[PDB]
Subunit: 349 residues, 3 copies
């Protein structure tokens, strides 16, 4: 979104945004200033005619807290790879999971949706994850036009290394964000004009900690079946996804859901003067939970609008109307049941 360097086959696109955001909620753990900013580089070098190396980095820096505070910045994306002209591409690092190739069609809300809802960050291959080799391929080895296919492999990421251990690595992490040797695949196709369909499947080994430290979720493998449909035409965005996860959807902080049925659907209209009203519904029903029965993990209706000044400046307002009923599951799992109203003005370069 801003190419600051272009010389001798090297281009360096420097992109990002400064989002001044504020939340209103009864939940005083999200209430207050939420002003953040993202910044990153997006460079590539040309090697020959049908070979181009590239790298990307996306850094997230929070700016709603004081300078006395700690751990206020992290790396969202960081990978490097090669482009084989048309035969596809290959990249490795911290990148989006292949399941996202479908789920991203509903991550189009003014502020909400996406991470922290039906899926989350470091949740196997459902979003951003560490050490993922992703082979993407445009137009299925040239065979089928418009058929974008992808394969992904993820390395084992266990607990913090030390005495006690149990499948440790150098990048040891919290119990809910671990993952074993996993793989995944995505597949998107434009069936008609403006209409697209997609499918994604992921399977990762689970570690001992995810069957021990937390109470919810027991099983050897974590699987995700994902399907999506997107209509983007006539100033209409209308998308829906659906995911059946097995030992893979987070149940707050208690563990994982042995069986989960995520479902997102969003509708937006784009005006000619720059107003984009958006209405969505997200739900995630968890089945066969250890202890509890069949419970709702997430359920809310979104409504809001985004006013676009131009390709760089915008402002937005969002309303999460939480439909979750307070029961014994949300009390100990720590799942919020309160409505939230977001209000933001973001500059974007």
């Amino acid at each position: 979104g801003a190419e600051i360097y272009n010389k001798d086959g090297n281009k360096l696109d420097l992109y990002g945004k400064i989002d001044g955001l504020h939340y209103f909620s009864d939940d005083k753990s999200v209430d207050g200033d939420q002003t953040y900013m993202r910044v990153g580089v997006k460079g590539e070098t040309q090697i020959n005619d049908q070979l181009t190396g590239y790298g990307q980095w996306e850094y997230n820096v929070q700016a709603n807290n004081t300078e006395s505070s700690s751990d206020q910045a992290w790396t969202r994306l960081a990978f490097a790879g090669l482009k084989f002209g048309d035969a596809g591409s290959f990249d490795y690092g911290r990148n989006y999971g292949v399941v996202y190739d479908v789920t991203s069609w509903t991550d189009v809300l003014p502020e909400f949706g996406g991470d922290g809802d039906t899926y989350g960050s470091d949740n196997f291959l459902q979003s951003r994850a560490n050490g993922v080799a992703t082979y993407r391929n445009s137009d299925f080895f040239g065979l089928v036009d418009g058929l974008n296919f992808a394969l992904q492999y993820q390395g084992k990421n266990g607990s913090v290394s030390g005495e006690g251990a149990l499948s440790p690595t150098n990048n040891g992490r919290t119990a809910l964000k671990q993952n074993g040797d996993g793989y995944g695949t995505s597949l998107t196709y434009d069936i008609y004009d403006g209409i697209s369909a997609g499918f994604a499947y992921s399977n990762s080994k689970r570690l001992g900690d995810q069957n021990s430290k937390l109470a919810l979720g027991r099983g050897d493998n974590a699987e995700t079946y994902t399907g999506g449909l997107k209509y983007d035409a006539n100033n209409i965005y209308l998308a829906t996804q659906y995911t059946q996860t097995y030992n893979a959807t987070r149940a707050g902080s208690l563990g994982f859901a042995n069986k989960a049925q995520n479902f997102e659907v969003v509708a937006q209209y784009q005006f000619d003067f720059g107003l984009r009203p958006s209405v969505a519904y997200l739900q995630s029903k968890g089945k066969d939970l250890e202890g509890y029965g069949d419970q709702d993990i997430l359920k809310y209706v979104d409504v809001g609008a985004t006013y676009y000044f131009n390709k760089n400046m915008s402002t937005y307002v969002d309303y999460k109307i939480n439909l979750l009923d307070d029961n014994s599951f949300t009390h100990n799992a720590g799942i919020s049941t309160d409505d939230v109203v977001a209000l933001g003005l973001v500059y974007q370069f």
Copy 2:
């Protein structure tokens, strides 16, 4: 200011500095290497004839500690807003308080003065603060030429969220850096040529934590009345500020002063070969302290010089001559009474 991008009405300025700095002092909590660097972007996009969107970000990175060290970087500024041609501007994020619109006239020392002295970072609206909606207006609605006035509103920033609570928010902070819903206004005018006067007023509700956890300072509202006069002409810089704060000036680490009288005054001369000697006096007399009574919170005379090679490179040396007498107040408040000698060489892009 090194403008690295300018294309199609969008500009991206990239500014900052790398200050290699060293302190000499009896206070062994500031003596030693102090090498820091700041870096940030200053971009803007043009929307229409009388509307321009902009954003700013300023990042501070310390470089005096080892690679093992923690919490060595923070965000000084990060906001986004709109400039209405002549009718003014409106911005939201982490920005400078309106009181700084005046007191900054004495934050012109080779290294000392300004933040961390009479006021500090996140000290209500006296300096940098989180979540401030600032409506500035150049030339008083076109009515009065040269009268720059500003209005500011600040959202509630409480304690860490959890059990116990007491007015919490998501950006919860230490008791001395909290603030409730506050407002403020500034007013600066160049009466003659080179002579300027200024006024600033801030009023924020104080939170329960600031009347409980720390001992000094009790009250419901925190107010700051500030006035300043600056003469900048004929190679003469001569400025003075003065602030009466009520439940707003930090008394080191003990709390706030129920009544405080901050006063800074600085005089500098600019030579033709790039040498700028500077002499200042900063004091902060605290009145009505719980226990201690009437004590001095800060009191020192500054003397030093800055040699400017050009508009980008410079070097400086400073001498803080602390006039504070050692008593029980400085012992419990953690207020330093020792002289400091700064010595720096700064590259600036």
Copy 3:
């Protein structure tokens, strides 16, 4: 490696890399994803005919862990200084020690070698260190053509300031990363064409903490004698270093070695299609250890290759074959005795 701004005597180079890296090892404290990225600026300003100011900054950002993790970024380099055209240069900040001016000729391995092996970060003047004033001089005061000489002084960097103290500073650090008032000098000369020789000497005071808290290493001064020989021509790189350190080489985590003999030797061939196989041997034999005696601190054989697509993209594989025998010294010092295999694809801008 990418000059984004160059106008009116000011140039602003923007360099760095995005290294997607993965380790395989029995030692499950280094195994797993290691994807890191470095990014920094390399600017300079022109002052007059024989005076040019410059500044440099190098930031290391880890991206192998989750966003929940802490302390994943640090500053490798950050300094500012003046270039006297040809008469030399002077810079201060966090910069490379003068001993590296020699040892860097063997830190040319595909991934391993350098920091964390025979020397380390913040290990007196053997690598990067805080608060170093470095006066370099190109072509020895005009006397001798081609003779690069350097002098460096380092300020005292002790423990964290507080009650108890014992030589404290504001940038207080871990016991093994401390350093007193030190100095050093390096001297490199190209004797033949492609053949170079170099010598370096450093002497720093040790603090009370390094003779008290840890058991190994006793003495008042820490000294390093370093010598190096480099042959770089005819697609042949062949270099060797040798260092006798006294109270200066780390003996893992037990303290310092009263006598250490570091020795590195590397041989590489550069093909015409971009393959650079490299074979090296690094060892560090420690003599006169408190309690143990004569032990091996480091000893392994390196073998690997770096395939260069071009000057920006590359991929590599490395093999650290550890020759260390398991004994009580490696048991208490925490020194790894396991083989490691690195595998990386790095974009470089």
